[PDB]
Each structure stands twice: as C-alpha cells, then as structure tokens.
Amino acid sequence: DCCSEPPCILQNPDIC
C-alpha cells in the first residue's frame, strides 16, 4: 500500500 511503499509515501503523502 502507499504507506508501505517508499515512492508513494514521498510522492503522494495524501494517498498514504
């Protein structure tokens, strides 16, 4: 998921 996936956390903190 976003919060367990470094690129997502950094690009889209909202999605996290």
CA–CA distances in Å: residue 16 to residues 1, 10: 8, 9
Cβ-in-10-Å burial (0-12, 13-18, 19+) of 8 comes to: middle
Separation of CA 12 from chain center: 5
Nearest-angstrom CA–CA distance, 3 and 15 = 8
CA max distance for the chain:
14
